[PDB]
Amino acid sequence: QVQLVETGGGLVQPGGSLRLSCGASGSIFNMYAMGWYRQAPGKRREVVARIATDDSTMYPDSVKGRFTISRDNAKNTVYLQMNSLKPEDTAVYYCYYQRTVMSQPYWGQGTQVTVS
Amino acid sequence: KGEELFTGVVPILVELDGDVNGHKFSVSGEGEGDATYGKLTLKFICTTGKLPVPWPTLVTTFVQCFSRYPDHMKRHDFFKSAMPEGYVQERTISFKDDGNYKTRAEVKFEGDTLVNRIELKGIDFKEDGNILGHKLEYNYNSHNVYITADKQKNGIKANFKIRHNIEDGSVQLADHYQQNTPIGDGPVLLPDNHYLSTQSALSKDPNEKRDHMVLLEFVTAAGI
Amino acid sequence: RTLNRYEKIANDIDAIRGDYENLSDDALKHKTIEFKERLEKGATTDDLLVEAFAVVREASRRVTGMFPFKVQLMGGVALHDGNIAEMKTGEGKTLTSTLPVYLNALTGKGVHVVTVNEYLASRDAEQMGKIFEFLGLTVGLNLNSMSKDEKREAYAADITYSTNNELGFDYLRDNMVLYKEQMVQRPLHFAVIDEVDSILIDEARTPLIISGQAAKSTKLYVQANAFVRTLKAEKDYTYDIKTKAVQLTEEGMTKAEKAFGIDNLFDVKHVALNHHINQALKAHVAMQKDVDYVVEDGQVVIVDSFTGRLMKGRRYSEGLHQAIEAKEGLEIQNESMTLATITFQNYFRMYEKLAGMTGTAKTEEEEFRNIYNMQVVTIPTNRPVVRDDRPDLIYRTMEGKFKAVAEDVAQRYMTGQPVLVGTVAVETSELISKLLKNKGIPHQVLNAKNHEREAQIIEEAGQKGAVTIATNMAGRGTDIKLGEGVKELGGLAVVGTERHESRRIDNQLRGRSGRQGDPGITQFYLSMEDELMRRFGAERTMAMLDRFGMDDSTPIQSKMVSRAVESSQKRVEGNNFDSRKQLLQYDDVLRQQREVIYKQRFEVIDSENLREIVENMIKSSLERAIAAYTPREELPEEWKLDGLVDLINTTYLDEGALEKSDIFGKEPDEMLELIMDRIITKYNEKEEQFGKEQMREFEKVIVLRAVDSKWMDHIDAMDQLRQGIHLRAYAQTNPLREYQMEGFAMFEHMIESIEDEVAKFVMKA
Amino acid sequence: AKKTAIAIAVALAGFATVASYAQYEDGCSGELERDSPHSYHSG
Amino acid sequence: FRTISNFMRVSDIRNKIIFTLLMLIVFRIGTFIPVPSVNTDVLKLQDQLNAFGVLNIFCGGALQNFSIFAMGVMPYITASIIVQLLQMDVVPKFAEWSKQGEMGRRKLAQFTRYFTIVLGFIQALGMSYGFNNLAGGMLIQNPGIGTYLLIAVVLTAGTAFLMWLGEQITAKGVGNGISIIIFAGIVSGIPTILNQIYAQTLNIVRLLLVALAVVAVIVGVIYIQQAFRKIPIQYAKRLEGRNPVGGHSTHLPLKVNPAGVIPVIFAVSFLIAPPTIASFFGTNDVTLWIRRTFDYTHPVGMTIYVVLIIAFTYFYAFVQVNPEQMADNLKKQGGYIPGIRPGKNTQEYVTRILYRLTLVGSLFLAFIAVLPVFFVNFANLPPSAQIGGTSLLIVVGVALETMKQLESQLVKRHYRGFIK
Amino acid sequence: QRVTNFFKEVVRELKKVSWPNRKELVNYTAVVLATVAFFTVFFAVIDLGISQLIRLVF
Amino acid sequence: VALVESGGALVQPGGSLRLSCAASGFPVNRYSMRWYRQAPGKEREWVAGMSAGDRSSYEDSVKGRFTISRDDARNTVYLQMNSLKPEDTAVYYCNVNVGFEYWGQGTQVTVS
Ligand SMILES: Nc1ncnc2c1ncn2[C@@H]1O[C@H](COP(=O)(O)OP(=O)(O)O)[C@@H](O)[C@H]1O
Ligand code: BEF
Ligand SMILES: [Mg+2]
């Protein structure tokens, strides 16, 4: 339903910092879950960042704390700020949305962050 | 008791040899007898060749103990007193317009099974009558055997007449005078006049080869 | 609540009462004529309720002196609605029974007052025949001892008092008649069942069987007796004490095989031999002499478990009664063979209205709602129950209980208070009577063998100083009226002796002294080798609590064993409830088969000309012969018409009336119509040849003989597979559904065989 | 042996509970599957 | 059809099939109501398909699952077989409740109810702990050992409701209650699997060969489910029927497959217990050997999975038929095998028959469980279209054994009479 | 040689099982494919129905 | 197998009569048919009989007189008597043997 773009990913050495800004087209945005997942080869595809209506930030056990997610309206953007990168995270990144409960969480395109 | 012991089905061997006008015959057979229903289902086989006198003139000579008795005539039987001890019967059989059978049989429980050993001698015959001309239809009628007792011989004298359907459309009325003797001498039972109402059926087997007589027969008694 | 409906009807009946009690005779019989004409004028019995009950209560004042109560009017209203009305034992239920019986007899059909045995049937007949013949109604009393015309005269009355056995056997022997006028029962209208918990609950388990007589085997019973009389009790057979079942041990099987000389008992060639040994082995040990039969003049007469009386024309089946007759050297007689069969639910649920009363219904209340769709109304007392129903005395071993019950009846005899000693067996009642022969007390034992006088023993069992030892005969309906002086010393102490198979039955034994207002002091004695404990007591307290120390100069004051006694009685009732549910849902299929076959044969009795029914049987057999020899799976002209034409020439159409050129390549439908037209013409020539009513009589005899013989065989085959269907749960298959499906297929092969028998006997004759 | 039997109870039971960690992986179903007669001689 | 017209003309069975369909609707709406506090976004994204070592899914995988009925009646199945295993001379409260009668059996069924509700609670805890521990690093919001209990008691209350409407549909609807519910839990996934097989697209040739292989294996499974070694029995205690037919002679139907499906259920339990305990230690050198040898799609995993199927169906066949209890039950009341002394020799006879007939149903069940790997390799289907296994064996079992029970009402209707 | 007799009598006792024959076998396969097809179509329809009704209830 | 006799009544000596025996349950053209007489007290003795075709044999004491024939179309056997003598006063019977032996109900003829 909404069109969704993802910027900020590219080429970086292991030990740097990045800022993934995911901007939307449809502007209401008060929804269930905004997030970020990988689907690298080796699939596993794990939700790397997860933010709810309360902005109750949830992070997995491998990348806990070092990252942060930031929401803003007046430009529909989530922010996966990334710190202290590692060569294992050589992956495409994706910014997903979901309106209410389950209601088929839709994907986006990704940014292939290469780190080695 | 005795034959009250044999309420179940009984094996029946029949062995017959005999002579008429110097001509030989020998017929055997086997089947079953029942007393609580009172029937005889007998498969008989001519084991010598061809019949001099025909099967209907044979059937009264081929075992009167397999009657069916209702509750009241249980006292009035002779044929459960000489059994299992054994039984002997001889008959004078007068054909009207022909000669005479003298039949000579012992009917006894040999081992277990009811064997009727018959030797028949048929004298006073002319061959150009009806019986040796084989003028008999393949059938046997229904009859009433009259039974009385004698005490000088303490046995059973039986009188009856029988009726053979002749193939010309006539009947041979032939009278049987029957003498009935025990072998053992235990409790004899000599009742009054009574009568066996009997009926028969003669048929054949479609999957059997030789000249064989199949007998099925019902006996009932009444009178007493 | 229906109790307030009942007391407002009772208050109506009390209010209107003033325009009676001055109304003379020959106006009340005139009122019976009035209700008959007003009932064939347009009103119904519910609208004629209050006036009919008022006139019965005033006529019952006038005839017998027992003016009815208010709770008795509530009982009459509760019975008329179809509801079971439990009135506590003593409160005058016989006199409530005349209220709806009189009401529902006015219309015209019968009213069967059913009761448990012939003593209280005859007692109620000559006590309430006075009330019912005071108002112009008839009363038939029905019995075992009557010929068919007397029973038809009894049933043709407006009211019939009978027992449940004689009603059920009249129904069965009506469905084995040959003519329409040899039937004793009218079409069934209404039953007021006295003591419904015996008839509809306890003894509704047992089925009524009628068995004509088959061939006499006598050798094998004497052989099997002379074998099993030498079997060294526990080393060669066993005897499960819980359910009475004896089998042979592994030594006894080898002993049997070398005593009869045979190879192997458990072969197939010796099934009958095995059968006789098992029945002989059950006739020795699993059922003792005076406990559950007697010997009367060289016949073993079996004694009822439930009523306590001896029932005379009845025999054990499956070859047992002859093994009992050969146990004792009596005359072995012939062997039965089942002709008809019913159960008391299946019979009593055909009655289009049925009522009932008891004292002890409530315990089984929902069962009357699950089985019969009747609710149990509970009705008050009208005088408080001042009956000191004291608790038990559990003892140790049996003879301690018997010494104590003799001491108790002695010390109640020394005051002159009458004592009724209940029991269940007859050898224990003569045991306790020979315990009271020494100690010197006059008494009157009432066994199954002393029935011939008992109707006056009761009127001596309630004066001063009586002692009365009674089995189950005086356990349900017996009205022991207290004499003179006895009410002051607290009359009729009932001393039980063992615990019965329900709280219903022993509560009714205590009710024998609960009588209206009068005091009575009941008491039960028990032991631990009492056979209800040895059969049905859990092993967590038998050896664990037979450690008290064997002296028995006192009861056992410890409530472990009282818990054991109550748990044992509750599991007896549980086993009977499970068996009753099981056999209810298995007998409810041969209910349907028997309703169909009895309806068809009652239709072929009372039809004027059954030409069309026999023709329909012959066409329904003909089409099945045709579709048998002409299948679908084969294409035509390979149908083997030779065998089909020979079957038509042998079975339906003489022996030269059909040849293959008459058919030779037609479709089977048109070939059966060109058989059926020749059959109809041959039949109509046989009708105009044989007579008009004589062919009706001929084909009715043929039809009824076929139906009856094939139905004997079908009852026997169905009860042969009902034994084996519980094995059929090892394929995990819900054995009731297997039984119901398989019984339907067996019933249809039975009807196919009936139609074949009727066809070839009607037109090969 | 009957003592063996209680092991064959417990061995599955706890394993059926420890397999529950991987019930994303199992997902299977499993089916459930399970007097003396007396006559009256007439005549 | 002329028989389904019969089924929906007669009143009560039409009312009860409509009651069954309404209760399946009440079932299947609850799969869309989720567990109250789980992050259902991570639940739907987590798709780690198959052929992975760690994920070697069996029955289709409970991945896009985790609704309130997601624990299933599988706790009731395993608790009921635990108490069935324990009635055999162990813990004699149950042995005396068994041998006493049927109102003790009500307390026994009540024990089974409480042992199900216990195992449902603790297995919901284990399932949610594992399913947040690796499938998605975070799945429950506000995570911690104090908040697993709310969602575990929601799951346990859910399958309590599922057993409730199971016994409601077995009282008032058509057939077995929970077997119709399990049949509704299996056959309600075939719409998605037809979407995936179609959305993949030997264009039609492959699918036609697949469909006729499915019908060939379904007629093989009907041919083995519906078969009986009818042992002839003979009750000595009545007169042999005075002139019987001998066509419907009392028999004793031993199934070919007496163990049902249950041995492959706890074969997959003992299969996946050692990887799920060795997953705790961390990735060692032996852990990868373990998950290579207990991956049941590789030819050491198939062989030990087959040997566990053979062993547990021999064991559970003897616990299901129980030859000692049935021989003692036969000589306790009458009957006997014709020719066989009815004490010990009839139990050794039915024991030998039971071995020689358990071998056939044994290797049948082994093949029917190693079929779906042999279609996913040799037919290139989506590797969640796993046809075979328990999900085949109990779809056809529940379908037939409620068809039969449904049409056994019509024979009650169709009594004829000879008159017509 | 216990196995070479054992499998022989396994094949012998397969000649004593009462196997379902071809007529009701084809009847049964028709029944089970009918029920799986009807319940597949029924569950597909009610899943579409409650999906499209919940997605307006939200 | 139902043989029914009819057509017999009282008669003065001289008025000719006709005897019918209608057969049911078998065709006559493959079974020999017979007629007997019986005076009261006297044995039920033979009169006449056909035999499955085109020949018949009578007793010698009533020859030249009786006629046993059959409607094979109407399944019936008929007996012409022709000129009564009082000797012929008897209960007449028709008889067959189709497996079992079958009589009729017995018809009355009385030459008064
Ligand atoms: N209205 C009444 N007045 C006085 N006595 C009554 C009345 N009704 C019943 N009785 C007495 O109550 C006793 C109960 O008898 P019965 O009806 O046999 O008991 P049950 O009700 O248990 O059958 C009878 O002896 C009868 O005399
Ligand atoms: F007090 Be009653 F006759 F049971
Ligand atoms: Mg009473």
Structure tokens at E186: 């299996």
Query: Which residue in the block uniquely carries the two structure tokens 């009986």?
Result: E228
Rg over alpha carbons for chain F, rounded to the nearest Å, is: 24
The continuous run of DSSP H or E covering C295 comes out as strand C294-295
Tokens of E189: 């996934």
C-alpha span between G29 and G22 (Å, rounded): 14
The letter for the amino acid at C534 is: R
How far is G95 from G104, CA to CA, in rounded Å?
7
Closest by CA position to E40, among listed A96, A72, G80: A96
For A18, other C-beta atoms within 10 Å of its C-beta total: 19
DSSP-derived 3-state class of residue C481: coil
Strands (E), C302-362: 314-316, 336-343, 354-357
Residue C107 dihedral angles phi and psi, to the nearest 5°: -70, -45
- CA-CA distance, B2 to C720, in Å (whole number)? 33
Kindly write down the DSSP assignment for every residue of chain A, as one continuous string: ---EEEES--EE-TT-EEEEEEEESSS----S-EEEE---SS----EEEEE-TT---B--SSSTTT-EEEEETTTTEEEEEEES--GGG-EEEE--B-SSSSS--B---EEEEEE-
- d(CA C602, CA C596) in angstroms, rounded, equals 10
Chain centre distance of CA E92: 28
DSSP H helical ranges for C156-240: 164-174, 196, 219-228, 233-236
- Distance set, CA B19 to CA B118, B121, C171, F38 (Å): 11, 5, 65, 86
The identity of residue C723, as a single letter, is Q
Q: Do D21 and E58 lie within an 8 Å CB cutoff?
A: no
Q: What is the DSSP string of chain G?
A: -EEEEE---EE-TT---EEEEEEESS-GGGS-EEEEEE-SSS---EEEEE-SSS-EEE-TTSTTT-EEEEETTTTEEEEE--S--GGG-EEEEEEEEESEEE--S-EEEEE-
Taking the CA atoms of C606, C608, C614 and C619 in sequence, report the sign of the dihedral they define.
negative
Closest residue on chain A to E31 (Cα): A102
CB G17 within 8 Å of CB G39: no
Residues C600 and C606: their CA atoms lie apart, in Å, by 10
Is residue C300 within a helix (H) or strand (E), and if so which, with residue range? strand C300-301
Other Cβ atoms within 10 Å of C419 Cβ, number: 26
Paired residues of A70 in beta bridges = A79
Ligand 2 proximity of C511 Cβ (cutoff 6 Å): yes
**How far is A10 from A91, CA to CA, in rounded Å?**
10
DSSP-derived 3-state class of residue E232 = strand
Q: Which of C371, C339, C379, C491 lies closest to C86, judged by CA?
A: C379
CA distance E211 to F36: 14
Contacts for F4 with CB less than 8 Å, ≥ 6 apart: none
Contacts of B123 (CB under 8 A, 6+ apart): B99, B100, B102
The distance from CA E350 to its chain's CA centroid, rounded to whole angstroms, is: 26
3-state secondary structure C550-590: CCCCCCCCCHHHHHHHHHHHHHHHHHHHHHHHHHHHHHHHH
In this complex, which of E25, E194, E400 lies closest to F28 when CB atoms are compared?
Answer: E400
Spatial separation of the C-alpha atoms in residues B16 and B28, rounded to whole Å? 6
Distance from CA of F58 to the nearest CA of A (A): 7
Q: How far apart are CA C549 and CA E375, in angstroms?
A: 76
Measure the N-to-C terminal CA separation of chain F; round to a whole number of Å: 71
Beta strand extents in C374-518 (DSSP E only) = 376-378, 419-422, 444-446, 467-470, 493-495
C74 exposed, middle or buried (CB, 10 Å; 0-12, 13-18, 19+)? buried
Angle separating helix axes E323-332 and E345-379, nearest 10 degrees: 140
**Residue G19 bridge partners (DSSP):** G79
DSSP string, A12-25: E-TT-EEEEEEEES
| DSSP H or E run through C210 | strand C207-213
Q: What is the Cα–Cα distance from E294 to E304, expressed in whole angstroms?
A: 8
In sequence order, what DSSP letters do the residues of chain B get, joined into one string? --SSS--S-EEEEEEEEEEETTEEEEEEEEEEEETTTTEEEEEEEE-SSS-SS-THHHHTT--TT-----TTTTSS-STTTSTTT-EEEEEEEEETTS-EEEEEEEEEEETTEEEEEEEEEEES--TTSSTTTT-B-S----EEEEEEEETTTTEEEEEEEEEEEBTTS-EEEEEEEEEEEESS-SS-----SEEEEEEEEEE--TT--S-EEEEEEEEEEE--
> What's the CA gap between A94 and A105, in Å, rounded?
12
Architecture of domain C213-342: Alpha-Beta Complex (3.90)
d(CA E212, CA E210) in angstroms, rounded, equals 6
- Among C357, C309, C292, C362, which residue's Cα sits nearest to residue C507? C362
Q: What is the CA radius of gyration of chain C?
A: 31
| Cα–Cα distance, A4 to A109 (Å, whole number) | 8
DSSP one-letter code for C549:
-
Q: How far is CA C1 from CA C4, C5, C99, in A?
A: 6, 7, 22
The sign one gets for the Cα dihedral E69, E73, E75, E76 is positive
Alpha-carbon dihedral sign for residues C543, C549, C554, C559: negative
SS (HEC) of C676-713: HHHHHHHHHHHHHHHCCHHHHHHHHHHHHHHHHHHHHH
Residue C232 CB coordination number (10 Å) = 11
**Residue closest to E187 by CA, chosen among G105, F47, C263:** F47
Q: Shortest CA distance to B138 belongs to which of C70, C510, G31, E95?
A: G31
Distance, in Å, from the CA atom of E59 to the CA atom of E386, rounded to the nearest integer, reads 7
| Chains G and B physically touch (3 or more Cβ atom pairs below 8 Å) | yes
Confirm if E340 and E349 have CB atoms less than 8 A apart: yes
Give, for C208, the enclosing helix (H) or strand (E): strand C207-213
Smallest Cα–Cα separation from F23: which of C742, C629, E219? E219
Distance CA E173, CA E402 (A): 11
CATH code of domain C591-764: 1.10.3060.10
Q: Order across the sheet with C376-378: list the strands.
A: C140-141, C160-163, C112-115, C191-194, C354-357, C84-86, C376-378
**Is residue E329 helix, strand or coil?**
helix
Q: Would you list which residues of C are annotated within the binding site for ATP?
A: 66-67, 72, 90-94, 479
The amino acid present at E163, given as its one-letter code, is: M
Find the CB nearest D40 among C169, C320, C729: C169
Upstream peptide bond of F20 is cis (omega within 30 degrees of 0): no
- What residue spans in chain C does CATH classification 3.90.1440.10 cover? 213-342
C2-210+343-378: CATH architecture: 3-Layer(aba) Sandwich (3.40)
Find out whether B145 and B195 touch, Cβ atoms under 8 Å.
Answer: yes
**Site from C164, C209, C738 to mutate, D interface, most D CB atoms within 10 angstroms:** C209
Tokens encoding E412: 């009650």
What 8-state DSSP symbol labels residue C387? Answer: B
CATH of region B10-222, choose from 3.40.190.10, 2.60.120.380, 2.40.155.10, 3.40.30.10? 2.40.155.10
Q: Which two tokens stand for residue C743?
A: 């019984």
d(CA C649, CA G58): 33
Q: Which two tokens stand for residue E138?
A: 């975070």
Residue whose structure tokens are 């559950």:
C292
Q: Which of C439, C491, C437 is nearest to C461 (CA)?
A: C491
Dmax (CA) for chain C in angstroms is 103
Question: What per-residue string of b and e applies to C652-663 under the rule 16 or more CB within 10 Å gives b?
Answer: bbbeebbeeeeb
Please report where in the chains the tokens 């018949």 appear, as a residue. Answer: G56
| Cα–Cα distance measured from residue C89 to residue C477, given in angstroms and rounded to the nearest whole number | 9
- Indicate the number of domains in chain A: 1
Say how many C-beta atoms besides its own lie within 10 A of residue B41's C-beta: 15
To the nearest 5 percent, what fractions of chain E are helix, strand and coil?
65, 5, 35
Provide the shortest C-alpha distance from residue C137 to chain D (in Å). 33
Residues E336, E348 contacting (CB under 8 angstroms): no
C115 in Cβ contact with C97 (< 8 Å):
no
Tokens of C134: 């005071």
Interface contact E356-F20, CB threshold 8 A: no
Rounded to 5 degrees, φ, ψ at C104 are -85, 0
CATH fit for domain C387-574, picks 3.40.640.10, 3.30.420.10, 3.40.1440.60, 3.40.50.300: 3.40.50.300
A100: Cβ contacts below 8 Å, ≥ 6 apart? A31, A32, F58
CB-CB neighbours of E203 under 10 Å: 7
Do C690 and G27 make contact, defined as CB atoms within 8 angstroms? no
* Residue-wise burial string across G8-29, b where 16 or more C-beta atoms lie within 10 A, e elsewhere: beebeeeeebebbbbbbbbebe
CA distance E79 to E163: 13
Note down the domain range covering A33: 1-116
Helix H or strand E encompassing C211: strand C207-213
**What residue spans define the domains of chain F?**
1-58
The two structure tokens encoding residue C290:
């005076």
State the burial class of residue B13 (Cβ atoms within 10 Å of its Cβ: 0-12, 13-18, 19+). middle
CB C735 within 8 A of CB C672: no
E74-86 vs E102-133: helix crossing angle, rounded to 10: 130
Question: Which of G1, G5, G24, G28 to mutate to probe the C interface, most C CBs <10 Å?
Answer: G24
> Which of C197, C516, C518 for a ligand 1 pocket mutation test, highest count of atoms within 8 Å of Cβ?
C516
Contacts of C138 (CB under 8 A, 6+ apart): C132, C157, C158, C159
The runs of H, that is alpha helices, within E46-101 are 74-86, 92-100
Task: Provide CB contacts within 8 A for E327, sequence distance 6+.
Answer: E342, E343, E344, E346, E347, E350
Residue C346's CB is within 10 A of a number of other CB atoms, namely 21
Q: Which residues of B touch G59 (CB under 8 A)?
A: 170
Runs of H (alpha helix) within C40-93: 49-64, 71-80
Residues linked to residue C315 through DSSP beta bridges, in sequence order: D39
- Tell me how far CA of residue C305 lies from CA of C448, C470, C576, E212, E259, in angstroms: 11, 14, 14, 66, 45
F 1-58: CB under 8 A from A: 55, 58
Residue written as token pair 């995990």: C732
CB B88 within 8 A of CB B183: yes
- H or E segment and range at residue C600: helix C559-605
Neighbour count for residue D43 (Cβ, 10 Å)? 6
Nearest-angstrom CA–CA distance, E216 and E223: 11
Please check whether residue E340 is in contact with residue E233, taking contact to mean a CB–CB distance below 8 angstroms: no
Name the maximum alpha-carbon separation found in chain D: 77
> Going by DSSP bridges, is the β-strand pair G76-80/G18-24 parallel, antiparallel, or unpaired?
antiparallel
Pocket test for ligand 1, best of C66, C73, C122, C509 (most atoms within 8 A of CB): C66
- Dist. CA E143–CA C189, nearest whole Å: 75
Atom of ligand 1 nearest to the CA of C91: 21
| Alpha-carbon span B160 to E375, nearest angstrom | 90
Q: For chain B, what is the largest distance between any 2 Cα atoms, rounded to a whole number of angstroms? A: 51
Q: Give kind and range of the element (H or E) at residue C115.
A: strand C112-115
* CB nearest C315 (choices: D34, D35, D38): D38
10 Å CB burial of residue D37 (0-12, 13-18, 19+) is middle
Atom in ligand 1 nearest the alpha carbon of residue C67: 1
Query: Both ends of chain D: CA-CA distance in Å?
Result: 61
CA–CA gap between residue B176 and residue B159 (Å, rounded): 6
Residues within 6 Å of ligand 1 by CB: C 66-69, 89-95, 479, 481, 516
Cα B12 from Cα B215, distance rounded (Å): 12
Phi first, then psi, for residue G73 (nearest 5°) are -70, -40
C80 within 8 A of C100, measured Cβ to Cβ: yes
Query: What single letter denotes the amino acid at residue A50?
Result: R
